[model samples]
Target: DRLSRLRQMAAENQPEPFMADFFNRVKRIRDNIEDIEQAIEQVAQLHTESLVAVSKEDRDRLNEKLQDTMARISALGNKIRADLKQIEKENKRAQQEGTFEDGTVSTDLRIRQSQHSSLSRKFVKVMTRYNDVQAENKRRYGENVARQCRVVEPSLSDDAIQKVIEHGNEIRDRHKDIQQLERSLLELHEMFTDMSTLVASQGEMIDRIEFSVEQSHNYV
Candidate 1:
């Protein structure tokens, strides 16, 4: 009984210099993910509004809001990535130097890593949904333009054909909006790539810890 009590005390007294910093970084990232998720929901709502907007002017106004929110999401994504890199660096050093207490450190890191991966997967899924919405909008607009052309085809002159197809400045503006959305998607893809790398690295460390634990169990 005395020996057991002493062992308990020793365990309780183990030093965890990196724990506070790690927790803070994880918390920040979690908060950023929550913000991003809420922004995505807002985007979805705005997209629905834009789809059925009565006038081109109204649609353009909603699109401007969508673009603003998307830009905010991109900024939050960058911040999360930066925070993740900091956690990764600290974790790497802790592993190398064996600074953290055994058992708890690996398990804690593994849990946080899984959280990060899951959050990233959610972000990716929502971005894909947004892309689909954009594509559908473009398709419907194109169909409308095509039907307009058909209606005017009977009396169409060569010079008038271009005017009918152009649909004035709206087509040009739509093209520019589409280009901007594509660029935003590309940036999100790059952010996901970096997040994947960090997740993979953490997985490797967790695997090593599990292997060692198994070895000890076998010996016992």
Candidate 2:
């Protein structure tokens, strides 16, 4: 779909645009790296801090904050990724078409490519850590809620059973939490797929490197 939209853009065909403009566009998108770095670090910091959440109300607030920050992080990462893809395509077209070369284009391509590679690695690690924390928390809480529900109403009718948690809210809350954690885990898998592709581009050392990237505990 993005390639489809990209093919329709005749703007790149016009030679009137200066390489200066292209460079500026790359810079604008590249600036997003700083924002992306800050956002993911916030996520990492929160994950480390979440282990100490003192009360249910405090934990809920922490989770709410994590969700809100993730929304911003996802949006920023997606936009920058899309922009980098487009910029890379345009750079290749320029190189192939022989429309621009003065060492500037090659350097620009190298710079953007490195920016993308760095951002992607960090992106995957942050996503991994965030999902890891969620998974561990679910292990701690989700099953306990389900067990408590079973304890409270062992004889309740099937129709009324789901509504019969020791506290009415427990079943519903556990259901919501488990559902969200499962979905988040699936997303992390998809992200690992994307990250695997990125890692493959580096070399055949990909299998081991990718495993190390995912499983290694970062002291940073």
Candidate 3:
């Protein structure tokens, strides 16, 4: 009952610090584009960092640290993305001269813009760190995977482990392809975000267009 009440209180808590940090996600078409780009950047960073530590004297410990940081960032990014979309929808509806129903919606365009810009800059900065990390992860993780393959190759002529390697490689390759797509998406996002300078800030009345930045952001 105590823990449940704590959860309830947290859930019911009105806008606060967590809420402030929560809004920093892009909720426009560019948002989706940005999402893929960041995902790739984050994953690439994880894989590459793990790769770099391969030759380090403290390789294992460093790898562990990198993995931990990567996971936390990944989780936070996921939340940031989700919340951005939600806030974007509310922001759009609230802007209407009239809404179907209004109690206390988040019509905070300033908050939304601030959130988007903050997340964008932070994410971009993080991407810089990831470049080197990814290079290392790709080098090291691939080597580790290959080494595992070699060790298993001598043990058994044919078995599930062999298939596991083949399939695992396939999955990794799929992720790589997605990463590539993410880069393309990121470029597109930049183009679109910049398009705001060309297009009207508020034009057509399309809800999806207004609320869903770039839906493909999650997949990539």
Candidate 4:
């Protein structure tokens, strides 16, 4: 109970926008994973059927196809894991720290009022979806940013020297590609951080709007 009270205090002191719409995105991630799992099951069923009554050559082909499918599934699983971590981090932060240091006793009223409204839940659900889309878009944008910062390798070719130079260039190019990816990832992360901050600021703006209006206190 003491720790809970401390957490409440900490949350009350949190900067604006720390807690908006993050959970809804988590739900979307869950939904997408479900769809992918269904597809995987369908493919697995087909693969098992092929193994039961196929020729040696056909079996070999099926094995190769299954290997590719497994690779794809592995890649999707990694993405799901990453998103889960992101969601966990966001939710933990929100729960531990309520957004908005400026809030006072009346801020509690505002928050509670918003929470109790039927429309609030509806809108928050919608906003959660937007959060998921924004996060996914930001992730993809980071990927593209990696492509933008890629470097070219020095090409060397000839039976005597060409092969050596080309090989070196290929290695150099791959290194450049990785570096470009890192650079883009850095930029994308910074942009996302900024977006999150902006969201908090926007929420604070809403809080002000609440006070501006002489809201009814019929419940009181």
C-alpha lDDT values of all predictions: 0.60, 0.57, 0.47, 0.42
- How does residue 197 of candidate 1 score in lDDT? 69
Cα misplacement distance, residue 15 of candidate 3 (Å): 18
TM values, all candidates: 0.61, 0.52, 0.35, 0.32
lDDT of 1 by residue, 1-220 (tens): 9999999999997775666766776677778777877887787677556543565879778878988998887787777777756655655655534424443335454554555455555555655565555555545444454334355346555554565446533444555655665676577567657656656644454334454453221111
**Which stretch of 10 consecutive residues in model 3 shows the poorest summed lDDT?**
211-220
**Candidate 2 lDDT:** 0.57
By TM-score, highest first, what's the ranking? Answer: 1, 2, 3, 4
Q: Which runs of model 3 end up more than 4 angstroms from their true locations? A: 1-59, 98-111, 114-132, 143-220
Off by over 4 Å in 4: 1-28, 99-220
Question: Model 2 clash tally?
Answer: 0
Better of 1 and 3 by TM-score: 1
The number of the candidate with the highest TM-score is 1
| Cα-lDDT of candidate 4 | 0.42
lDDT of 3 by residue, 18-104 (tens): 544443334432454455456556555445444434344544554465456555545555454455456556556555532223222
Residue 83 miss distance in model 3 (angstroms): 3.0
Q: Judged by lDDT, which candidate is best?
A: 1
